[PDB]
Design an enzyme around this catalytic site. Structure first.
Site, PDB file in Angstrom:
ATOM      1  N   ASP A 149       0.830  -1.203   0.000  1.00  0.00           N
ATOM      2  CA  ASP A 149       0.000   0.000   0.000  1.00  0.00           C
ATOM      3  C   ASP A 149       0.868   1.258   0.000  1.00  0.00           C
ATOM      4  O   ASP A 149       0.603   2.210   0.734  1.00  0.00           O
ATOM      5  CB  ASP A 149      -0.921  -0.019   1.231  1.00  0.00           C
ATOM      6  CG  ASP A 149      -2.074   0.968   1.132  1.00  0.00           C
ATOM      7  OD1 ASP A 149      -2.317   1.522   0.040  1.00  0.00           O
ATOM      8  OD2 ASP A 149      -2.747   1.186   2.164  1.00  0.00           O
ATOM      9  N   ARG A 153      -0.688   9.021   0.867  1.00  0.00           N
ATOM     10  CA  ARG A 153      -1.498   9.102   2.082  1.00  0.00           C
ATOM     11  C   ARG A 153      -0.863   8.349   3.252  1.00  0.00           C
ATOM     12  O   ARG A 153      -1.168   8.624   4.417  1.00  0.00           O
ATOM     13  CB  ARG A 153      -2.902   8.541   1.824  1.00  0.00           C
ATOM     14  CG  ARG A 153      -2.892   7.086   1.412  1.00  0.00           C
ATOM     15  CD  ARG A 153      -4.283   6.498   1.201  1.00  0.00           C
ATOM     16  NE  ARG A 153      -4.168   5.178   0.583  1.00  0.00           N
ATOM     17  CZ  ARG A 153      -4.040   4.989  -0.727  1.00  0.00           C
ATOM     18  NH1 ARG A 153      -4.026   6.034  -1.539  1.00  0.00           N
ATOM     19  NH2 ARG A 153      -3.888   3.768  -1.222  1.00  0.00           N
ATOM     20  N   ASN A 154       0.020   7.403   2.943  1.00  0.00           N
ATOM     21  CA  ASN A 154       0.648   6.578   3.969  1.00  0.00           C
ATOM     22  C   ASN A 154       2.090   6.986   4.269  1.00  0.00           C
ATOM     23  O   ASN A 154       2.819   6.258   4.936  1.00  0.00           O
ATOM     24  CB  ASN A 154       0.606   5.106   3.545  1.00  0.00           C
ATOM     25  CG  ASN A 154      -0.807   4.559   3.506  1.00  0.00           C
ATOM     26  OD1 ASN A 154      -1.656   4.958   4.302  1.00  0.00           O
ATOM     27  ND2 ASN A 154      -1.066   3.644   2.578  1.00  0.00           N
ATOM     28  N   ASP A 170       2.409   4.159   7.719  1.00  0.00           N
ATOM     29  CA  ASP A 170       1.243   3.305   7.928  1.00  0.00           C
ATOM     30  C   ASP A 170       1.499   1.945   7.307  1.00  0.00           C
ATOM     31  O   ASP A 170       1.985   1.855   6.181  1.00  0.00           O
ATOM     32  CB  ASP A 170      -0.001   3.924   7.285  1.00  0.00           C
ATOM     33  CG  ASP A 170      -1.243   3.063   7.461  1.00  0.00           C
ATOM     34  OD1 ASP A 170      -1.448   2.121   6.663  1.00  0.00           O
ATOM     35  OD2 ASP A 170      -2.020   3.333   8.401  1.00  0.00           O
TER      36      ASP A 170
HETATM   37  C1  LIG Z   1      -1.004   7.218  12.610  1.00  0.00           C
HETATM   38  C2  LIG Z   1      -0.665   8.627  12.099  1.00  0.00           C
HETATM   39  O1  LIG Z   1       0.665   8.946  12.616  1.00  0.00           O
HETATM   40  C3  LIG Z   1       1.148  10.249  12.616  1.00  0.00           C
HETATM   41  C4  LIG Z   1       0.452  11.385  12.147  1.00  0.00           C
HETATM   42  C5  LIG Z   1       0.970  12.693  12.148  1.00  0.00           C
HETATM   43  C6  LIG Z   1       2.273  12.801  12.671  1.00  0.00           C
HETATM   44  N1  LIG Z   1       3.004  11.732  13.149  1.00  0.00           N
HETATM   45  C7  LIG Z   1       2.452  10.471  13.120  1.00  0.00           C
HETATM   46  N2  LIG Z   1       3.214   9.400  13.598  1.00  0.00           N
HETATM   47  C8  LIG Z   1       0.146  13.815  11.607  1.00  0.00           C
HETATM   48  C9  LIG Z   1      -0.891  13.788  10.575  1.00  0.00           C
HETATM   49  N3  LIG Z   1      -1.403  15.002  10.355  1.00  0.00           N
HETATM   50  N4  LIG Z   1      -0.748  15.812  11.194  1.00  0.00           N
HETATM   51  C10 LIG Z   1      -1.093  17.224  11.187  1.00  0.00           C
HETATM   52  C11 LIG Z   1       0.193  15.180  11.977  1.00  0.00           C
HETATM   53  C12 LIG Z   1       1.008  15.864  12.944  1.00  0.00           C
HETATM   54  N5  LIG Z   1       1.681  16.398  13.719  1.00  0.00           N
HETATM   55  C13 LIG Z   1      -1.457  12.646   9.743  1.00  0.00           C
HETATM   56  N6  LIG Z   1      -2.546  11.846  10.411  1.00  0.00           N
HETATM   57  C14 LIG Z   1      -3.620  12.601  11.080  1.00  0.00           C
HETATM   58  C15 LIG Z   1      -2.651  10.414  10.457  1.00  0.00           C
HETATM   59  O2  LIG Z   1      -3.565   9.799  11.019  1.00  0.00           O
HETATM   60  C16 LIG Z   1      -1.627   9.535   9.803  1.00  0.00           C
HETATM   61  C17 LIG Z   1      -1.600   9.555   8.369  1.00  0.00           C
HETATM   62  C18 LIG Z   1      -0.671   8.762   7.663  1.00  0.00           C
HETATM   63  C19 LIG Z   1       0.231   7.947   8.377  1.00  0.00           C
HETATM   64  F1  LIG Z   1       1.105   7.200   7.706  1.00  0.00           F
HETATM   65  C20 LIG Z   1       0.229   7.903   9.792  1.00  0.00           C
HETATM   66  C21 LIG Z   1      -0.703   8.697  10.551  1.00  0.00           C
END
Ligand SMILES: C[C@H]1Oc2cc(cnc2N)-c2c(nn(C)c2C#N)CN(C)C(=O)c2ccc(F)cc21
Length: 295
Positions: A149, A153-154, A170
């Site tokens: 994937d 987005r990830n 992700d």
């Molecule tokens: C599980 C989550 O992890 C994190 C999210 C963020 C920062 N660091 C981590 N580890 C984050 C995001 N946006 N913002 C503003 C911040 C901040 N600061 C993105 N987001 C809301 C997600 O859910 C997401 C999206 C994709 C992905 F690969 C992992 C995640």
């Protein structure tokens, strides 16, 4: 329930349990459809906190545990770190490296050059993001882990500004396979043999990385504009490929088209992809190409 990665078997026992009292939630970061994500701090250590809803099935519980094991067992600078877990209190937490630049798709869309900020991004910024993720992918490939994937987005960014590092953040699809529906499949990121025969190899991720490259150099557009999943499925199987993103240098587009070779054997591994990205970064004609300014 055990997890195997590389040579080693790990268990819930191996996860680093952080005392719940040491964890403070600060603000939401944009919650998904299942489980919230917060900015938090550990006693201070800045973290992102992924939560498991207390109203969940046993399979959800096992899914959450497996995600924690998967991320905790990776060790690479272009894969988001797991700082620890809090599984002995409810709601359960996974604690991650805080990537303050947010996800890559949103970053690209929000940071597009505009008449007010005409120099927000340059070709080199995009090449560095591409190199960062390809380095993470190479690490996965050499450890025989198929992501399944790879997509903007990830991916996450350490910060919005100049020193940003991109990382894979992700692993939900890989987790699901290790342990769903057609409508939820990342069709637009998958190679012909993947959605036809269900055959997966590291050349699966090569194809997806090509699509990520298109996302990056298009500055965050959805792949195959105006095409639905099934339309893309038929288009790709018939040999159809995306056109270059606006202003995309030829050498970069050629990396995409190599990633999208019909035969997996004809697609580059990530070592080669990295070599070609590096060569692009050396080429003045590539990095001196202006990105479009959105009006
Ligand atoms: C599980 C989550 O992890 C994190 C999210 C963020 C920062 N660091 C981590 N580890 C984050 C995001 N946006 N913002 C503003 C911040 C901040 N600061 C993105 N987001 C809301 C997600 O859910 C997401 C999206 C994709 C992905 F690969 C992992 C995640």
């Amino acid at each position: 329930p055990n997890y195997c990665f590389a040579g080693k078997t790990s268990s819930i026992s191996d996860l680093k349990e952080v005392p719940r009292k040491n964890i403070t939630l600060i603000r939401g970061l944009g919650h998904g459809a299942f489980g919230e994500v917060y900015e938090g701090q550990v006693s201070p250590l800045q973290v992102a906190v992924k939560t498991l809803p207390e109203v969940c099935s046993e399979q959800d519980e096992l899914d959450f545990l497996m995600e924690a094991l998967i991320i905790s067992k990776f060790n690479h600078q272009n894969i988001v770190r797991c700082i620890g877990v809090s599984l002995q209190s409810l709601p359960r937490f996974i604690l991650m490296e805080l990537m303050a630049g947010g996800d890559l798709k949103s970053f690209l869309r929000e940071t597009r050059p505009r008449p007010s900020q005409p120099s927000s991004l340059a070709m080199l910024d995009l090449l560095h993001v591409a190199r960062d993720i390809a380095c993470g992918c190479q690490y996965l490939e050499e450890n025989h882990f198929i992501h399944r994937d790879i997509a903007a987005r990830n991916c996450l960014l350490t910060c919005p500004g100049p020193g940003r590092v991109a990382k894979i953040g992700d692993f939900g699809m890989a987790r699901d396979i290790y342990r769903g529906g057609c409508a939820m499949l990342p069709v637009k990121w998958m190679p012909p043999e993947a959605f036809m025969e269900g055959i997966f190899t590291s050349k699966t991720d090569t194809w997806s990385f090509g699509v990520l490259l298109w996302e990056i150099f298009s500055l965050g557009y959805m792949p195959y504009p105006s095409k639905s999943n099934q339309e893309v499925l038929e288009f790709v199987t018939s040999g159809g490929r995306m056109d270059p993103p606006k202003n995309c240098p030829g050498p970069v587009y050629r990396i995409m088209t190599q990633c999208w070779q019909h035969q997996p054997e004809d697609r580059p591994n990530f070592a080669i992809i990295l070599e070609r990205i590096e060569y692009c970064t050396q080429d003045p004609d590539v990095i001196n190409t202006a990105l479009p300014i959105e009006y």
